[PDB]
Amino acid sequence: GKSHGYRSRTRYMFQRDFRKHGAVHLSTYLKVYKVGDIVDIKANGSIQKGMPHKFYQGKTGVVYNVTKSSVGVIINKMVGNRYLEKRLNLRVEHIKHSKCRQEFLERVKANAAKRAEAKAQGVAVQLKRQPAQPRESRIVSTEGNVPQTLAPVPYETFI
Amino acid sequence: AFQKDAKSSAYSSRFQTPFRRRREGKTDYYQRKRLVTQHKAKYNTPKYRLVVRFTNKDIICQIISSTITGDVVLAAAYSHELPRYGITHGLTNWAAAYATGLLIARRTLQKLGLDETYKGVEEVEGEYELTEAVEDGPRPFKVFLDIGLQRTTTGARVFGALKGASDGGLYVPHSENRFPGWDFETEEIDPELLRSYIFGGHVSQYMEELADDDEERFSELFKGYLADDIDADSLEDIYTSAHEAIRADPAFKPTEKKFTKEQYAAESKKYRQTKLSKEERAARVAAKIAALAGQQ
Amino acid sequence: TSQLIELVGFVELKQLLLEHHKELKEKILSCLTMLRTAEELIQSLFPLLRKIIYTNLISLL
Amino acid sequence: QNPMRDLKIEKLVLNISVGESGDRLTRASKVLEQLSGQTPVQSKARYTVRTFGIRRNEKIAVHVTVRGPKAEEILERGLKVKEYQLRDRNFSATGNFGFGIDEHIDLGIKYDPSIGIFGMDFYVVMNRPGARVTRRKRCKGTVGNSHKTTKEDTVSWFKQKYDADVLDK
RNA sequence: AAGCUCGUAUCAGUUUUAUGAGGUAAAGCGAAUGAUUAGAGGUUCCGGGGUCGAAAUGACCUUGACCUAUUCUCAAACUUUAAAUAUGUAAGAAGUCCUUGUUACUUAAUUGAACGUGGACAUUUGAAUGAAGAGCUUUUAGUGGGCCAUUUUUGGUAAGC
RNA sequence: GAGAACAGAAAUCUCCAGUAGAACAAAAGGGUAAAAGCCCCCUUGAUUUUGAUUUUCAGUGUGAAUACAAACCAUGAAAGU
RNA sequence: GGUUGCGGCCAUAUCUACCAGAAAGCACCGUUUCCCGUCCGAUCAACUGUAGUUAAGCUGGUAAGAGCCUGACCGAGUAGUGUAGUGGGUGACCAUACGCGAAACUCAGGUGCUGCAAUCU
Secondary structure, three states: OOOOOOOOOOOOOOOOOOOOOOOOOOOOOOOOOOOOOOOOOOOOOOOOOOOOOOOOOOOOOOOOOOOOOOOOEOOOOOOOOOOOOOOEOOOOOOOOOOOHHHHOOOOOHHHHOOOOOOOOOOOOOOOOOOOOOOOOOOOOOOOOOOOOOOOOOOOOOOO | OOOOOOOOOOOOOOOOOOOHHHHOOOOOOOOHHHOOOOOOOOOOOOOOEEEEOOOOOOOOEEEEOOOOOOOOEEEEEOOOOHHHHOOOOOOOOHHHHHHHHHHHHHHHHHOOOOOOOOOOOOOOOOOOOOOOOOOOOOOOOOOEEEOOOOOOOOOOOOOOHHHHHHOOOOOOOOOOOOOOOOOOOOOOOOHHHHHHHOOOHHHHHHHOOOOOOOOOOOOOOOOHHHHOOOOOOHHHHHHHOHHHHHOOOOOOOOOOOOOOOOOOOOOHHHOOOOOOOOOOOHHHHOOHHHHHOOOO | OHHHHHHHHHOOOOHHHHHHOOOHHHHHHHHHHHHOOHHHHHHHHHHHOOHHHHHHHHHHO | OOOOOOOOEEEEEEEEEOOOOOHHHHHHHHHHHHHHOOOOEEEOOOOOOOOOOOOOOOOOEEEEEEOOOHHHHHHHHHHHHOOOEOOOOOEOOOOOEEEOOOOOOOOOOOOOOOOOOOOOOEEEEEOOOOHHHHOOOOOOOOOOHHHOOOHHHHHHHHHOOOOOEOOOO
């Protein structure tokens, strides 16, 4: 009568993925992730073997192990006020390659040569770059560009 | 053929080419996946592979290190090394690839730390055996290959190139199911017939049916051999003395060279045309609105 | 392969008819009425010489 | 130009349709054998038909492909039968050609009443040197435009050597 | 309401960095659902029923399923899978560079990776830096019957919900 | 689409064009082309012991998936799974 | 400069209709005593380097071609969305001040890039 028993049930989610594509991009099973690579519950489209609530989205724990499945993470369930327990992670279709540990280490770590130059030089170091301070009084010109007075066109009554 | 079908312009949207090495055909991701790329159980490891490409049965051996960015060729063994020694022709057979495998096991070995170690046998009789490496220290070296195509068959100069390298100290866990003289029925090995493809016994065998049977192609086939007086048992002495040239000086001496990349940098643009800028060729641009596409 | 005979049985398909055309004939008329061309079936009885099944099918058609 | 872009025959393929398996087919096969020396190949029905009286996978036809010299003999030999007159169709836009003959006896070959009388067709596919480029395993390519066999080019070839006539418009 | 344990000690209604996750757009019925459409012209011992020959494979109709010859090609909201615009996680004494140890991993090879010690980058020490306190445990009472307006979204066949 | 001896718009054979409406275990939809598939040949790693990780969870029960080392096999010329 | 094997790069390559190719370096064609693989020596495998050949493929050139990509105060300081605010209005809608801000169409330019090894007047 129903659809369970031996091998059935769950008629809500039933396959794959897409996005980039070249397989899953053939470099997942090859390289071994370490401390920093987070396996956010990504690629759940076909990995909903007990799909959680729609509330669990965004939170993250701390990676401690990398293997076949995924890494260990937490999802501070901000339900009502504070955050509940629990850890999560994700299957294998949600395994990613975070670029947050790439671009951030190609701008700050790249300026390591400017740090080792103060004692034998004279202060003025660190990569604490200035955001965007307001410009002061600059010097401009006029010769070479004759000013022109413009005016908005007379918008008449028409369909 | 689009002169009959004539597809639309909206049909070309989901178009996606493969590798450059796919259309032209150079790289495959089903054999290389287990050649260059590997699990991080070994991490950074200079996995040297041997690239072999026999065009017109020409000896070509290349050694390229496994690098994801910037490939560096360690060594290379072509067919322009045997005429340097003394071997004119007869370098397109299995015996030539057998000597090449031994030659590449001495040239690359010279820059591989020491040359005294990793040898084996020098008698050359054709016998399936395992090289005994030095206990505690010098581990048995394993050479990797790199091909792509070429059907899995017996009696291959390409496949038998590892056999010639096996007698050079290079320890590779291979089998004996594909030797020139193997029976498909039982699992017995015949080293007697195997020797025939080493000293060129199969080559002189066909010559026996030319001075009594096939006389029509007698003047055609086997012509370069008569120029070097090769018809009797002199052919056997060629591959025999070929091993002496291997341990001679495997340093690979350059050829004539004569003016490399300097004086020969001006030859192409002397007869052909080039895509010159439109700012200089305004005579051809203004001609389009004349009679070329401006109706007379 | 009467095992897989009953195989296509428990199954087997229109490709199962192909496999069948590649007692015993019990499973025979079984999947017979199963797939149930009918011409194939007359010829079936053909290669043949179950009974109940055939009779019922004929009476119903 | 022309050097090395001659016009060999790639292959001749004789083919016998027989709306059934059994004796009448193994006899068609016997014909193709003794005629080619090669043991011929059987073809199964692709689907079932009924108005043709055949079932999927029935074994319904034999044929055989024949290459070099032996090809030219049987070509000419049956080409005879056709009085050296084909037609302007008969030739494909890709430059191959064929014809049928019934009565496989009209080209050598005795009678034998325990064999019967079968047709005598077979297609002729033409090419030039360097066909291999489109056919080998590695670096598989397609042959250049000004090298492809065509109808014009093959007809003219036929009209020449053989001397035979083309026919129709 | 009643306690214990600490300190450069909990970050943000405004601005930059785009790696995951999803089932609303597209397509198919050629093995899954549905509104898989609408006609004419033949052949009859024996597909199944009458009248007329005592009969013999003597002969002649009507009422239902096919074949040949045409048309449509099946609604977006049945199911599965799959996009653009978008939003968390990433913010260094906890990390990096130069010199140097060990092992049962890797390599022909004290080579790399992982795992230690010491020294320097010392007031621009890893955007800007506002900010009348922080974490943990236990217990009690009330509440499990309200309404309206603005902005956005779905539905919306007068008045109107 | 373009041919032919038996042979009609369908059957057997050959050639050309052609970036996927296909094939790829259930009903279905992207993948991928010297195929991840189909056929032939060659088969028993779809079985056991000892750990750990992902979704749900109280680092659960059950079920399923991914990734090593240590015994025991098969395929292959080599490199592998 | 060119060419071959092995990578990175994924329409800045491939398709239709043409032209060019003195040397070196490929491919096609030829052979069937051995091995592997068929109905067929076409593909694959094996053997050989003496003989038709710039005929095919690749590369290059040609092009108000087609497709795709880059750039511009050209389209367009657009449309949509957010915050604040007692402007008109029954609803469906239409504006001002202070940030950010679409695609397609028009115009112009380019017509693959690069490392190692080997060969070559």
